[PDB]
RNA sequence: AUAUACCGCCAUCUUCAGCAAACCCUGAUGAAGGCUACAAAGUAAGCGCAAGUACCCACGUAAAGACGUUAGGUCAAGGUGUAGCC
């Protein structure tokens, strides 16, 4: 009955069944979810079956300086208005239900190559529009409790960078995905590593290191070489501003340790000015395109050392069997040199 | 337009900007490493297939030897070696056409 | 731009605020700053500041002492002339009264009581949205009662705040920007440091005042 | 665990009003009755009729002023007279407000054979007492 | 028909005191933790406990008693999603 009727919000609650058993324990549902709808906004207070014209709400009260009165909307006008409402609801539902196209990063259903936009503004006011974000991984860690049992909390790792040699990574943990994202983005913009680069696009020299049982070898390359590296390394290099490199990872594959070790290496790298100021000699670069020409890169800011470095033959050097293999060419592997995508 | 004025036009800039054309294109393929041989063609029987390459989807473009600032899009300005079709994201047909055009 | 010129003028001049006249090695030996804990209390990073050992006791290099002290005083006086806010820390209860009193007399501020977690990093949330953190920290006792490095040096190195601490044989001068070797525990040395800082900051303040008065005249 | 005329606590982004924020055991302790009549008192009668007409007119005017209200009604029945008191938002036009006021007044009068008056207080946005 | 879709209403540990948004820090920036007052990293919105109100008091009795566990009970108070008789 009319008295039996009641407000719509409780109807929608009971129809959705948002909470009570389906949600808890994480059992969820087999991909059926009823979307709430607002009919209150849809039709204005005027519409009815009997299309009486109301000068108070439906029609302007005065026309040509003449008062109006109640009148009848005939059958043709009534059905016209009905068709208009039908089509309007159709376009409303169409615009409601549409595709969602978030840029495919590393793969579908993967949160790797997506950017969340620049960092959030600070309280004092600091717009980081130049900074860009990327999400390295996403994993749903669980810890158990007496009353809750399995408790899901999402952890996220993110990195951010200018594109001008300044960047930084961070982590964010929370029950909500967006909240964890925001936490991690703020943490990263607060914790920033800066790294130098030789010609604005490369490291100064080849590096090889290990970090928590994760071995890495990053090799300098000239211009137009490309980025044949892990996808995470490529994202962070895009953020840094360097556009060519080679990189290989062996042993463990853990994203956080990888990022930490890579940033550690790129921060401990040596600049040519520092190396000259340390050694006391003039640096000389030689190219393959340019002939036997000494190209001075940097000189010691202090006084030059008179005697040169004594040429040391058969030096004590630790090197890699993989490097020796690649130099000898006897190595063979179908998976090494491929026609991969753009950079 | 058969001439190369579509590039100097403003619609090309606003649609691409200062970046290359191949930069925005992305391939749908199997997991991890993509196939080493691109699709054979982007159009067939006056019909276009899904996810076509950019030069094929933009019919206004014309692969011509004369458009130097276009044909230099793919070959690196620092390395005279042209890029391969899996790199540029285009089909083999227009790839070969572009190769002989640039030659 | 002339304001920046005035701010930069004292930079090129060394000992421009007359800090060398303040201290002398005689006064240091009188205040017993050369003392140190036993060799068992020795620390690797503090080794090079130790001139030697005697009777299971360590002795500090007073030349390095005076050098670092001159550098630190000149820095503090430059910051005071620049209006940079300075904050003292000394968890030692034996001198909190005196330190707060000399801080009042100087006009500069201090914190002798228990240091609270996240006081500096989360200082915005603690106090308010916009708060002017002190541009310089100093330490009259680097270590806490538990004899571990106070959290303030780490937090300051984090938020890029310079620090000037007097380091005992047990302390870690690695994180400190301008560490001054000395005797943290002796009241004579404590009073000496307090008076030196009083003189320094007061000279800097009055010099800034007279300089800005001269510029207003001109 | 009892759930009665009270709101579940959320993360803290839930604007809540006084009456639905407070519990049903704070009626006389920290609230007032929305309706005011003597049918509940001893000696009188017609309490069922009072209550049914109360709920009827509440739901009626709620559905004839959709999206404009920001609280429950307050009814004041002094002898034969009836006074409705509501709080609404300044969303729609005063034209519509006055027209609907007159319409509802006339309908209530002709239906319940009762002298009726109505008062409403405008607010820019519905007041919030807490964020639950 | 489905309380193993739900709202609405409640049993329950509770004859509990914990639950916690938003920040910071530690662990090599891991799952996670953050307790020492003669004090060593926690700061805490909010909820609840509590306080106060009801009965005869300030005690006592009632009332209240959060986050959640039992897919706890209830489609037969009423309404309602889905599946059905129509
Ligand atoms: Mg997919
Ligand atoms: Mg009960
Ligand atoms: Mg049940
Ligand atoms: Mg009870
Ligand atoms: Mg109570
Ligand atoms: Mg059950
Ligand atoms: Zn094609
Ligand atoms: Zn000591």
User: Rounded to whole angstroms, how far apart are CA atoms A166 and A164?
Assistant: 6
User: Rounded to whole angstroms, how far apart are CA atoms C184 and C200?
Assistant: 20
Say how many Å lie between the first and final Cα of chain C, rounded.
15
Return the closest-CA partner of residue A200 out of A237, A232, A164, A245.
Answer: A164
Tokens representing residue A15 in the block: 């129809």
Distance B70 CA to ligand 7 centre (A): 17
The full length of chain C comes to 218
User: Rounded to whole angstroms, how far apart are CA atoms C180 and C168?
Assistant: 9
Instruction: Number of helices (H) and strands (E) in chain D: give both, helices first.
Output: 4, 5
Q: What is the DSSP string of A254-282?
A: -HHHHHHHHHHHHHH---HHHHHHHH-S-
Tokens representing residue A174 in the block: 């929370």
Which protein residue has its CA closest to C1' of E40?
C146
Distances (CA, A) of B24 to A102, B18, B55: 15, 12, 12
The neighbour count for residue A225, using CB atoms within 10 Å, is: 19
- A and C interact (at least 3 Cβ pairs within 8 A): yes
The neighbour count for residue A124, using CB atoms within 10 Å, is: 9
Q: Give the dihedral of Cα atoms C133, C134, C138, C144; nearest 10 deg.
A: -20
Reading phi first (left if > 0) and then psi (alpha if -120 to 50, else beta), residue A149 is in left
Three-state secondary structure call for residue A215: strand
Residue A142's H or E segment, with its range, is: strand A132-145
Return the closest-CA partner of residue D95 out of A61, C192, C60, C207.
Answer: A61
Does any CB of chain C come closer than 8 Å to the CB of residue A330?
Answer: no
Residue A231's H or E segment, with its range, is: helix A231-240
Q: What resolution (Å)?
A: 4.0
Tokens representing residue B35 in the block: 């196939």
Q: Which domain holds residue B2?
A: 1-103
From residues 1-40 of D, list those within 7 angstroms of strand E by Cβ: 1-6, 8-9, 11-12, 23, 25, 29
User: Rounded to whole angstroms, how far apart are CA atoms C176 and C141?
Assistant: 12
User: Regarding beta strands C136-141 and C163-167, do their DSSP bridges make them parallel or antiparallel, or are they unpaired?
Assistant: parallel
Q: For residue A197, what are the β-bridge partners?
A: none
User: Rounded to whole angstroms, how far apart are CA atoms C101 and D131?
Assistant: 46
User: Rounded to whole angstroms, how far apart are CA atoms A281 and A34?
Assistant: 74
The neighbour count for residue C168, using CB atoms within 10 Å, is: 24
Return the closest-CA partner of residue B27 out of B73, B82, B90, B97.
Answer: B90
What residues in chain C have their Cβ under 8 A from chain A's Cβ atoms? 124, 129-130
Reading phi first (left if > 0) and then psi (alpha if -120 to 50, else beta), residue B93 is in alpha
Query: If 0-12 CB within 10 Å is exposed, 13-18 middle and 19+ buried, where does residue A298 land?
Result: middle
Name the method of structure determination: cryo-EM
Q: For residue A132, what are the β-bridge partners?
A: A161
Backbone angles phi, psi at C20, to 5 degrees: -65, -35
The neighbour count for residue C1, using CB atoms within 10 Å, is: 5
Residue B91's H or E segment, with its range, is: none
Q: Which residues contact residue A310 at a Cβ distance below 8 angstroms, ignoring those fewer than 6 apart? A: none
Q: How far is C130 from chain A (nearest CA, A)?
A: 6
Distances (CA, A) of A342 to A297, B22, B34, B91, C217: 31, 8, 12, 14, 67
C92 touches strand E (CB under 7 A): no
The neighbour count for residue D31, using CB atoms within 10 Å, is: 14
Helix axes C62-81, C2-12, angle to 10 degrees: 170
Distances (CA, A) of A103 to A30, A132, C138: 26, 15, 51
Q: Which residues contact residue D130 at a Cβ distance below 8 angstroms, ignoring those fewer than 6 apart? A: D15, D16, D21
Distance D30 CA to ligand 4 centre (A): 20
User: Rounded to whole angstroms, how far apart are CA atoms C70 and C11?
Assistant: 15
Q: What proportions of chain A, in percent to the nearest 5, are helix, strand and coil?
A: 25, 20, 55
Q: What is the DSSP string of chain C?
A: -HHHHHHHHHHHSTTTT--TTT--HHHHHHHTTT----GGG--TTTGGGEEEEETTEEEE-HHHHHHHHHHHHHHHHHHHHTT--EEEEE--TTSHHHHHHHHHHHS-EEE-SPPPTTTTTTHHHHH-SS----SEEEEEE-B-TTSSB-HHHHHHHHTT--EEEEE-TTS--SS-SS-EE--TT-HHHHHHHHHHHHHHHHHHHHHHHHHHHHHHH-
Q: For residue C59, what are the β-bridge partners?
A: C52
Residue A330's H or E segment, with its range, is: none
As for how many domains chain B has, the answer is 1
Distances (CA, A) of C4 to A104, C9, C10, C82, C205: 51, 8, 11, 11, 18
Distance of CA A163 to the CA centre of its chain: 15
Q: Which residues contact residue A341 at a Cβ distance below 8 angstroms, ignoring those fewer than 6 apart? A: B27, B34, B86, B87, B89
Q: How far is A10 from chain D (nearest CA, A)?
A: 13
**Strands of C163-167's sheet, edge to edge?**
C109-111, C86-90, C136-141, C163-167, C180-181
Return the closest-CA partner of residue A134 out of A234, A229, A235, A233.
Answer: A235
Tokens representing residue B47 in the block: 């019909």
Q: For residue D119, what are the β-bridge partners?
A: D85
Backbone angles phi, psi at D69, to 5 degrees: -80, 160
């Amino acid at each position: 009955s009319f008295f039996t009727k009641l407000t719509a919000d409780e109807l929608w609650k009971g129809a959705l069944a948002e909470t009570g058993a389906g949600a808890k324990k994480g059992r969820g549902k087999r991909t059926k979810k009823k979307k709430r709808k607002d009919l209150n906004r849809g039709q204005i207070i005027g519409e009815g079956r009997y299309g009486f014209l109301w000068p108070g709400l439906n029609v302007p009260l005065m026309k040509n300086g003449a008062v109006q009165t109640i009148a009848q909307r005939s059958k043709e006008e009534q059905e016209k208005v009905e068709a208009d409402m039908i089509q309007q609801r159709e376009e409303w539902d169409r615009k409601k239900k549409m595709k969602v196209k978030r840029e495919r990063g590393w793969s579908g259903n993967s949160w790797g190559g997506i950017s969340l936009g620049p960092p959030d503004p600070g309280p004092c006011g600091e717009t980081y529009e130049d900074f860009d974000t990327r999400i390295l991984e996403v994993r749903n860690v669980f810890t158990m409790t007496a009353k809750e049992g399995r408790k899901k909390s999402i952890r996220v790792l993110v990195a951010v960078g200018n594109g001008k040699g300044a960047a930084g990574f961070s982590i964010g943990k929370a029950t909500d995905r967006m909240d964890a994202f925001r936490k991690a983005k703020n943490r990263a913009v607060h914790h920033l590593h800066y790294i130098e680069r030789y010609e604005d696009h490369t490291i100064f020299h080849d590096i090889s290191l290990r970090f928590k049982r994760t071995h890495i070898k990053m090799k300098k390359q000239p211009k137009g070489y490309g980025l044949r590296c892990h996808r995470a390394i490529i994202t962070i290099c895009r953020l840094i501003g360097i556009k060519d490199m080679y990189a290989k990872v062996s042993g463990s594959i853990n994203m956080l340790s990888l990022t930490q070790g890579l940033f550690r290496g790129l921060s401990r790298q040596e600049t040519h000015q520092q190396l000259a100021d340390k050694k006391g000699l003039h640096v000389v670069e030689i190219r393959e395109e340019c002939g036997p020409l000494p190209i001075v890169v940097a000189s010691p800011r202090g006084p030059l050392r008179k005697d040169p470095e004594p040429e040391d033959e058969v030096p004590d050097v630790k090197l890699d069997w993989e490097d020796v293999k690649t130099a000898q060419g006897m190595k063979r592997s179908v998976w090494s040199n491929l026609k991969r995508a753009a950079t | 337009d058969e001439p190369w004025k579509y590039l100097e036009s403003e619609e090309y800039q606003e649609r691409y900007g200062s970046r290359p054309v191949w930069a925005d294109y992305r391939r749908n393929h199997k997991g991890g490493v993509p196939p080493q041989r691109t699709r054979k063609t982007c159009i067939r029987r006056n019909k276009v297939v899904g996810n076509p390459c950019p030069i094929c989807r933009d019919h206004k473009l014309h692969v011509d030897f004369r458009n130097v600032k276009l044909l230099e899009q793919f070959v690196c300005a620092h390395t005279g070696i042209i890029f391969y079709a899996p790199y540029t994201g285009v089909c083999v047909k227009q790839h070969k056409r572009l190769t002989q055009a640039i030659q | 731009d002339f304001n920046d010129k005035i701010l930069n003028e004292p930079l090129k001049h060394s000992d421009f605020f007359n800090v060398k006249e303040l201290f002398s090695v005689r006064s240091l030996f009188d205040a017993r700053v050369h003392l140190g804990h036993k060799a068992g209390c020795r620390h690797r990073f503090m080794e090079p500041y130790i001139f030697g050992s005697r009777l299971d006791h360590d002795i500090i290099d007073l030349e390095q002492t005076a050098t670092h002290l001159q550098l630190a005083l000149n820095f503090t006086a430059h910051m005071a002339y620049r209006k940079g806010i300075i904050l003292f820390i000394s968890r030692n209860r034996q001198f909190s009264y005196l330190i707060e009193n000399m801080a009042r007399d100087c006009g500069e501020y201090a914190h002798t009581r228990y240091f609270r977690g996240g006081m500096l990093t989360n200082a915005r949330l603690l106090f308010g949205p916009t708060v002017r953190l002190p541009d310089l920290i100093i330490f009259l006792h680097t270590l806490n009662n538990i004899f571990e490095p106070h959290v303030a040096v780490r937090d300051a190195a984090k938020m890029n705040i310079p620090t000037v601490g007097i380091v005992d044989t047990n302390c870690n001068p690695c994180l400190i920007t301008y560490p001054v070797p000395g005797n943290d525990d002796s009241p004579l040395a404590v009073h000496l440091y307090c008076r030196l800082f009083q003189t320094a900051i007061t000279r800097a303040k009055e010099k800034r005042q007279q300089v800005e008065a001269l510029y207003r005249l001109q | 665990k009892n759930r009665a005329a009270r709101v579940r606590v959320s993360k803290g982004d839930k604007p809540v009003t006084y009456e639905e924020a407070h519990a049903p055991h704070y009626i006389a302790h920290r609230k007032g009755w929305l309706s005011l009549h003597t049918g509940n008192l001893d000696g009188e009668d017609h309490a069922a009729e009072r209550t049914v007409e109360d709920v009827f007119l509440r739901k009626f005017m709620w559905g004839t002023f959709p999206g404009c209200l920001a609280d429950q009604l307050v009814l004041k029945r002094r002898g034969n007279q009836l006074e409705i008191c509501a709080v609404v938002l300044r969303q729609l036009s005063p034209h519509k407000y006055y027209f609907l006021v007159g319409y509802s007044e006339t309908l209530l009068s002709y239906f319940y054979k009762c002298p009726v008056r109505l008062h409403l207080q405008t607010v820019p946005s519905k007041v919030v007492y807490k964020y639950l």
